[PDB]
Amino acid sequence: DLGHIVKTIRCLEEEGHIDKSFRERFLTWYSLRATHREVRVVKDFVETFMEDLSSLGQQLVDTFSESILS
Amino acid sequence: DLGHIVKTIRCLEEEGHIDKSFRERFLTWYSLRATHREVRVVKDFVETFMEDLSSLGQQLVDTFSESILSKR
């Protein structure tokens, strides 16, 4: 998920909620120094975010489909 | 709200849930044919996601600032 983690942090930062300095320090730390437990914990965060993000995708697709097909 | 919708769709794009066509197709509908209710529904879903991102933002910062900063 080393690509997935970049895409999550990027996503958070792109929409506000995280600043540039934190994103680049986070990704340096994640890639070089985070311990196996610390990588598990971040993986939970990204999984929560992936399920949040997918839910919203289905809402928007379903909203759009319902408006067109009705 | 529009900027939140566009940047959200990007976040959907990069993870590949959504097909390529959806962005232009959804934005054209959202901006040009969505009823007052459909527009409200779209903003409300996107605010509920923004609130998930804000909470997740703070939880990432609070949980890991020490481990990140301590190693310089």
Residue numbers in the entry:
A (entry chain CCC): 532 to 601
B (entry chain AAA): 532 to 603
Paper text:
The Arabidopsis VEL proteins are accessory proteins that interact with PRC2 to nucleate and propagate silencing at the FLOWERING LOCUS C (FLC) locus, enabling early flowering in spring. The VEL domain adopts a compact globular fold, consisting of four α-helices in a quasi-antiparallel “up-down-up-down” configuration, each of which contributes to the hydrophobic core, as illustrated by VEL1VEL. Mutations blocking polymerization of this VEL domain prevent Polycomb silencing at FLC.
As expected, these interacting residues are all invariant or semi-conserved, except for I575, whose counterparts are also hydrophobic in VIN3 paralogs but are typically threonines in VRN5 paralogs. Indeed, dimers are seen in every single crystal, regardless of the mutant, space groups, or crystallization conditions.
